[PDB]
């Protein structure tokens, strides 16, 4: 994961520019869709819930799990740690063999928009757009820094 940001894209739903996720790899490209998935599992139905006098309490564990917590696991660093678990790709693809073609006149009120497209696929075609003049600046330059070095 060497960049991961919004990027938009002509969703084939409605034809149109729509905000999704998007991932880079040092030789590969992730995408999908956002579920609403966010640390939403604290709302059971239940008839209201009950204590009793009996508990745990304590400190300084906590605190062991703060400051980069992934050192007590010295198997691999800056590595795909829990990936296929902890995400769930929904879309992949191969960068070290695609054309990127940034757009300074996309479509539909978008001066800013890259279109990709491999020579080696099937005459395909991509569109990306990022907010940032800069993020799509740099992430074509990124593309084509994984795949001038894969």
């Known amino acids: 994961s060497i960049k991961n940001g919004i990027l938009y894209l002509e969703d084939p739903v409605n ?9 880079l790899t040092s030789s590969k490209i992730y995408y999908s869709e956002e579920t609403s998935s966010d640390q939403g599992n604290e709302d059971e139905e239940e ?8 508990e745990l309490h304590s400190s300084l564990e906590v605190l062991f799990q703060g400051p980069n917590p992934a050192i007590l696991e010295p198997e691999r660093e800056h ?3 829990n990936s296929p ?26 001066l800013f928009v890259f279109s990709i497209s491999m020579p ?18 740099d ?9 001038q070095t894969a």
């Open 79 to 81: 590595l795909d740690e």
């Open 139 to 147: 992430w074509v330059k990124k593309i084509r820094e994984v795949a």
């Open 120 to 137: 080696s696929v099937a005459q395909w075609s991509l569109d990306v757009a990022a907010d940032s003049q800069e993020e799509l600046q």
């Open 47 to 54: 008839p209201k819930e009950a204590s009793g006098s009996t």
């Open 15 to 23: 034809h149109e520019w729509y905000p999704h996720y998007f991932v």
């Open 85 to 110: 678990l902890g995400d769930l790709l929904r879309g992949v693809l191969d960068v070290p063999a695609c054309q990127i073609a940034i757009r300074p006149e996309g479509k539909n009120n978008r």
